[PDB]
């Protein structure tokens, strides 16, 4: 009996309390306010040095949280590396979607560097100078460091504290190999006719109609780890080819990740920075269920590069309402739905695949 | 949606929006939609050979007790000589093969007012429509209806305080998912409903941590409300599938198999992994075979001091009833013969 909480209603001014399990929507707070505590300054420095001595030149980021962690750590890490006489410099760029997967893993050094600090927020005083050898974190550096020499998914979250004025995150370096997404920050719940699969960057909702189905999703990233089966509801009798969000894109292997008449969206607009999956027509558009439509393929935006909308769309076997994506660039359609009258070469498409 | 919570172990508090699952193991108000529809359904079932009802859970039994007087008032007002008798609940609630019908028309006379202001009691009639009790000889199990109601309220909402039920149109086998809530967060998970609260934890592997049951249902836990349903055998679940135990890896423990012959006759158990007061259990491969669950005290109150298991795992599986502290099927006494102890007379 440690997790006690209350819930409030703002239209009736009443409150119910009790004990149980509480799952919070933390997706919309992709915030830099957090303060990050990787393994240790000396320990992280020794691990990165051993990785450089092993022939690993860089890192692919699992999610935005690791990218922000590297940005917050890089300066002090460089300073402590210089204070130990190691000619190496860490350069951190931005993330690009989808976040592809690397085959290497960081090592766990037997001993750390015996010169430097003991805490991450302690002190970063003297800035380091650029060095010949650069250990580059993700960015537009695929030429000087290919993906095959680039590590991925090397950190293990230990504690997610919630203080009065700030919230802090504690990390370590994994002893053993892993393919799954970190389970310490995953929360799944179902009650009645509604369910949620969620973590720090995903918030996926389901509903019970005649059949359980996907209702809407809100993604602020497209990671490529595997959703653990222990944090998934109804993981049997489901084919990987039916999941709306592909299994390669960290979509849960669940009956809650389906929709009747649609198949896996391997060719959706996965290049965006943030998208939301909705089941309705795009603004000023309309779709027909007629057999004589075209074969499914890459997803198409509803507005031409000139800014003109299209008012004719068809699908062969889809079910109303249609599957539509929502990025800042516009309102894409699903792979099933194709233009009815206009040629498809006049429209912009998705050049990525899962 | 909006709420706040406290964590006493980590000493932190927080607020926000999300999804909350509470421990409900009364706060809510359970009565059927229409008394006249229920009266018509009962009469039509009686005319077609169906004589009794076996409750799925305690909630249905409480609802029947609340509604029986008004139901008899409607039955007597309409010229029908039928009596509804409601008795106590004996665990486990066994499953009946019949179902209540849906009447095409309701009774011509009566009132749909939830509560009956008129306390005019009807005269006892020689025809009895018994609800669950010690009445297995007036109405045997083969003529009893079971799981005939649909809880027609759902959702993540938590401020309603009023639950409505109606007779369903389609046959069903599963526990009603309107009152089921399961949740996992980090290293702790729960499978729960109005009567079950089953907890699992993340050790080197996921396993059963502790359970707290206040009834013994025999419906089937829905697969849509279960975590990690694949790659699991039915012979490994600690709580058997026949007793509405979820078919999941969270319902397992290393070195143990399904407890088909545990003390399910009791009225409230508490499964946990530790010794009974003043007892120790050893690990010797020469111990006995799996069999019925035995208490730690004899019929006179004498506490046994020596138990063995062949291939179990410390700490030992034990049940905490109100009148004893039993063990699992794999733990047997080292010295005392078993023919004088008390063992469970029920099987799943």
């Amino acid at each position, epitope marked *: 009996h440690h997790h006690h909480g209350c819930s409030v209603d703002f239209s009736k001014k009443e409150t119910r309390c009790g004990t149980g399990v509480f799952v919070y929507n933390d997706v919309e707070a992709w915030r830099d306010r957090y303060k990050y505590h990787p393994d240790s300054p000396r320990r992280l420095a020794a691990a990165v040095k051993q990785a450089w001595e092993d022939g690993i030149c860089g890192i692919s980021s699992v999610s935005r949280m690791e990218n922000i962690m590297w940005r917050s750590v890089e300066g002090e890490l460089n300073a402590i590396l210089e204070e130990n006489g190691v000619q190496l410099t860490v350069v951190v760029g931005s993330v690009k979607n989808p976040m592809w997967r690397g085959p290497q893993r960081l090592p766990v050094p037997v001993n750390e560097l015996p010169h430097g600090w003991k805490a991450w927020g302690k002190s970063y005083f003297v800035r380091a100078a650029k060095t010949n050898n650069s250990f580059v974190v993700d960015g537009d550096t695929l030429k000087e460091c290919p993906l095959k020499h680039r590590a991925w998914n090397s950190f293990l979250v230990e504690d997610h504290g919630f203080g009065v004025f700030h919230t802090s995150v504690w990390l370590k370096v994994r002893e053993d190999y892993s393919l799954e997404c970190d389970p310490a920050v995953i929360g799944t719940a179902v009650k009645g006719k509604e369910a949620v699969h969620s973590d720090l960057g995903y918030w996926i909702e389901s509903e019970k109609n*005649d*059949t*359980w189905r996907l209702k809407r999703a809100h993604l602020i990233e497209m990671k490529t780890c595997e959703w653990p089966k222990s944090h998934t509801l109804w993981t049997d*009798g489901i084919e990987e080819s039916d999941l709306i969000i592909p299994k390669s894109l960290a979509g849960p292997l669940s*009956h809650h990740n389906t929709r*009747e008449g649609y198949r896996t969206q391997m060719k959706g607009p996965w290049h965006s920075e943030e998208l939301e999956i909705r089941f309705e027509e795009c603004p000023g558009t309309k779709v027909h269920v007629e057999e004589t439509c075209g074969t499914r393929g890459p997803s198409l935006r509803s507005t031409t590069a000139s800014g003109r909308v299209i008012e004719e769309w068809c699908c062969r076997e889809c*079910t109303m309402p249609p599957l539509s994506f929502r990025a800042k660039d516009g309102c894409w359609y699903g792979m099933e739905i194709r233009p009815r009258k206009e040629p498809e070469s006049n429209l912009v498409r998705s050049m990525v695949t899962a | 949606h909006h709420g706040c919570s406290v964590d006493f172990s980590k000493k932190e508090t927080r607020c926000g929006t999300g999804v909350f699952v509470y421990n409900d193991v009364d706060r809510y108000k359970y009565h059927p939609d229409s008394p006249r529809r229920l009266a018509a359904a009962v009469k039509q079932a009686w005319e077609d*050979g169906i004589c009794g009802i076996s409750s799925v859970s305690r909630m249905e039994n409480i609802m029947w007790r609340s509604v029986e007087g008004e139901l008899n008032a409607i039955l007597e007002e309409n010229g029908v000589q039928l009596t509804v008798v409601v008795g106590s609940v004996k665990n486990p609630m*066994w*499953r*009946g*093969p*019949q*179902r209540l019908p849906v009447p095409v028309n309701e009774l011509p006379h009566g009132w749909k007012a939830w509560g009956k202001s008129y306390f005019v009691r009807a005269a006892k009639t020689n025809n009895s429509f018994v609800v669950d009790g010690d009445t297995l000889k007036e109405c045997p*199990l*083969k*003529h009893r209806a079971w799981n005939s109601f649909l809880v027609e309220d759902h959702g993540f909402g938590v401020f309603h305080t009023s639950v409505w039920l109606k007779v369903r*149109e*389609d*046959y*069903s*086998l*599963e526990c009603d998912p309107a009152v089921i809530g399961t949740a996992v967060k980090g290293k702790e998970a729960v499978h729960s409903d109005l009567g079950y609260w089953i907890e699992s934890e993340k050790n080197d592997t996921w396993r059963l941590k502790r359970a707290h049951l206040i009834e013994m249902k025999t419906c089937e836990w*829905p*697969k*849509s409300h279960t975590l990690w349903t694949d790659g699991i055998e039915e012979s490994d679940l600690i709580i058997p599938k*026949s007793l509405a135990g979820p078919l999941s890896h969270h319902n397992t423990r290393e070195g143990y198999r399904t407890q088909m012959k545990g003390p399910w006759h009791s009225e409230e158990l508490e499964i946990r992994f530790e010794e009974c007061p003043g007892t120790k259990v050893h690990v010797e491969e020469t111990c006995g075979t799996r069999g019925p669950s035995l208490r730690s005290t004899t019929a006179s109150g004498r506490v046994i001091e020596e138990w063995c298991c062949r291939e179990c795992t410390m700490p030992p599986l034990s049940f905490r009833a109100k009148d004893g502290c039993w063990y699992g099927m794999e733990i047997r006494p080292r010295k005392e013969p078993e023919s004088n102890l008390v063992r469970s007379m029920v*099987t799943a």
Partner: antibody
Amino acid sequence: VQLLESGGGLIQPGGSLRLSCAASGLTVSNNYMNWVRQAPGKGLEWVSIIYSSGSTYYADSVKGRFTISRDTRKNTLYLQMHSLRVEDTAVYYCARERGWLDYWGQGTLVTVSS
Amino acid sequence: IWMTQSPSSLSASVGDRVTITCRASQSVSSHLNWYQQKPGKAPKLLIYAVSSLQSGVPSRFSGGDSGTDFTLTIASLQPEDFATYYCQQTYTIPRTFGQGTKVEIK
């Protein structure tokens, strides 16, 4: 009501077949539906079941090869069959279950040989 | 739950009483059904819930027994009542049938 099976015929070993059961008088989304087979000159055998909630179960003989399914719009059952063996030759029925099988189909014939 | 049905075959003339016996290796609550199948035709449900009779089935059929055993009884062996009979349990997955009992004209 009336249920009618389809898709039966002749297939060589290792081939794939897909049966259908068209339902009239009842909708399949609110019913428990079974598939039952009977090898020529032998007794009845249970194959698979789908609940009204969508849960599926299979026999140990066909597990990993057969897949029961349904479609809401067309109101029909399906039974996808893969890696067919010689011992899969029988007559296949679809049925409705409410505690008992009270509505059977006519049956369809599946033969596996060369 | 395995179901053993005896006798394997039966022969008797018109007007006699014949009883078919089914056994279950475990406990079934009351979920036992009796079916009748004729050559070339789909099976037909006769008795359900141990004793409950199905509509349209004549009154010559009745089932039910005490203990771990179940029986199906024929009142008057009409000459259109020669077929194979099976017992089924609908209590546990997997569903199981009996091997069948053939009733032939004597």
